[PDB]
């Protein structure tokens, strides 16, 4: 299990690991999280409780190197950074344990959530969506822009989510316009997976790392994103039922998850009403429908 | 973005334009079948091409060849008419492609914008204005070209005969308008006014009457009375 340390907490703030959330009050003597489970991409997020604006945070994998948050007064943020002396480091973490000021990653241990969440999601994928070579952590925040985005205004600043867009050459093969619009399985199938992600595992890893931008910093860009990769395979009459099957699940977890209050923002009537009721795929996510059904009636 | 009363003038202006009108695309008779079930039989079509400034219609006959061992037909005459649109488009030199097509329905935006990714400078735009285009096939000389038509045909006529010699575009398109809202409210009565003087004869290149400017004023006049009369009857008022 590894750990994030942090300097001080040198402002009130809401921190979350993952889908967990602790308040931590100004200047209490707060020095990280550790038993972060190893092998899956973490995210360390940030809400000061005197700008409840600008919710932003870091995604990380502690398998890539020794990790801790500093509050920057300068910039105003706490700022994630990389301890290269390991011995600095080891006796910095074993020091704030045994002094035990810091909380423990709450993972039930039945509970699969995270997991279920970022199946898909690579750090490598992370690091091209989010570019900053020279740090092996992810900047993300509520107000970043996507490419796409910025095509409809910092390059540097940007979410590079693949481009999807349904009226578009790309998406259309001259003389198959209504074949291609109205069954958009020739851009999913052969310009999305078999072009540009190369296989089901990368398309669902930006798709599950863009619901995670959506909800965890409330980025309007990654909702939109999210939402478009799922009505690219609702849309298509010929998707592999492995990857109908996968999908059903991550749609499952990402429902699950969601907060109850936040349905009004985060899910888009229109992509939802036809995936579930007037798409190719109405009747390939049960689990999806059973769940939206119980949870977001009025959505629907 | 949408076409209406109020950015009206902006169809006579030097920027080209097309209205396009997708109506009378697809067309059925209903029958009973010899079991006494319902059937339909297709029946040629038109695509309504105008250029508002010049009169100028391209109407593309839709021959019921198109509509053979396909489904869903009133969802591909949406995409049939953005085709052959766009197919008017690519065939007309630069200079002449519309800056702008007006679609009369909403449904047609999508198959148009698809169809035109290629000419990504031409707006397609919607309107709010509920145009009698609809009544092009209660015009004699456009409903005999259709009905007679064994294949697929594009026939160019000017829809306002030699009016622009004498009246702005404007008011030819006001006209135009008068006579297809007088002939979808009541095509009878409509043709009566129209064809009541035999003195008064159709060019062979025209399509309506060579009235002087004081018969078109009466003939204006008498159309009016035809749409407010059968709008009593219509609502009761």
Redesign the interface.
């Known amino acids: 299990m590894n750990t994030v340390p942090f300097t001080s907490a040198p402002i009130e703030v809401t921190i979350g690991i993952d889908q967990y959330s602790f308040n931590v009050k100004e200047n209490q003597p707060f020095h990280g999280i550790k038993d972060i489970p190893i092998g899956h991409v973490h995210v360390i997020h940030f809400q000061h409780a005197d700008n409840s604006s600008m919710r932003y945070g870091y995604w990380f994998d502690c398998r890539m190197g020794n990790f801790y948050i500093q509050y920057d007064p300068k910039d105003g943020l706490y700022k994630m950074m990389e301890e290269r002396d390991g011995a600095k480091f080891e006796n910095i973490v074993h020091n704030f344990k045994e002094r035990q000021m810091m909380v423990s990653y709450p993972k039930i241990d039945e509970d699969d959530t995270w997991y279920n969440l970022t199946e898909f999601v690579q750090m490598d994928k992370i690091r091209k969506i989010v570019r900053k070579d020279e740090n092996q952590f992810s900047y993300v925040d509520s107000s970043m822009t996507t490419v796409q985005e910025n095509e409809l205004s910092d390059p540097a600043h940007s979410l590079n989510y693949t481009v999807i867009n349904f009226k578009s050459r790309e998406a259309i093969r001259p003389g198959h316009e209504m074949e291609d619009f109205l069954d958009k399985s020739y851009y999913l199938n052969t310009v999305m997976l078999q072009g540009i992600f190369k296989n089901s595992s990368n398309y669902f890893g930006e798709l599950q790392f863009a619901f995670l931008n959506a909800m965890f910093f409330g980025n309007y860009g990654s909702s939109l994103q999210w939402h478009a990769m799922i009505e690219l395979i609702c849309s298509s009459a010929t998707v592999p039922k492995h990857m109908l099957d996968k999908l059903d699940e991550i749609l499952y977890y990402q429902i699950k998850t969601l907060p109850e209050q936040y349905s009004d923002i985060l899910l888009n009537e229109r992509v939802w009403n036809i995936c579930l009721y007037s798409s190719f795929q109405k009747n390939s996510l049960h689990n999806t429908e059973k769940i939206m059904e119980n949870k977001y009636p009025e959505l629907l | 973005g949408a076409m209406n009363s109020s950015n009206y003038a902006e169809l006579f202006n030097n920027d080209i334009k097309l209205f396009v009108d997708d109506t009378n695309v697809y067309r059925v008779t209903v029958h009973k079948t010899f079991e006494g079930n319902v059937a339909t039989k297709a029946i040629n079509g038109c695509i309504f091409t105008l250029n508002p400034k010049t009169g100028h219609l391209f109407l593309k006959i839709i021959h019921t060849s198109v509509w053979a061992g396909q489904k869903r037909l009133s969802?591909?005459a949406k995409?049939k008419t953005?085709?052959e649109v766009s197919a008017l488009v690519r065939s007309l030199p630069k200079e002449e492609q519309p800056k702008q097509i007006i679609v009369t329905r909403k449904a047609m935006l999508?198959?148009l914008?698809?169809?035109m990714?290629?000419f990504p400078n031409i707006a397609i735009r919607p309107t709010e204005l509920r145009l009698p285009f609809s009544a092009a096939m209660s015009i004699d000389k456009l409903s005999d070209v259709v009905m007679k038509a064994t294949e697929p045909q594009m026939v160019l006529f000017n829809i306002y005969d030699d009016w622009l010699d004498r009246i702005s575009s404007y008011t030819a398109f006001s006209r135009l308008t008068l006579l297809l809202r007088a002939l979808k409210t009541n095509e009878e009565s409509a043709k009566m006014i129209l064809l009541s003087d035999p003195t008064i004869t159709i060019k062979s290149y025209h399509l309506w009457p060579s009235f002087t400017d004081e018969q078109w004023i009466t003939i204006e006049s008498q159309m009016r009375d035809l749409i407010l009369t059968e709008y009593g009857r219509k609502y009761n008022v």
């Open positions: 969802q591909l995409w953005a085709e999508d198959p914008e698809v169809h990714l290629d």
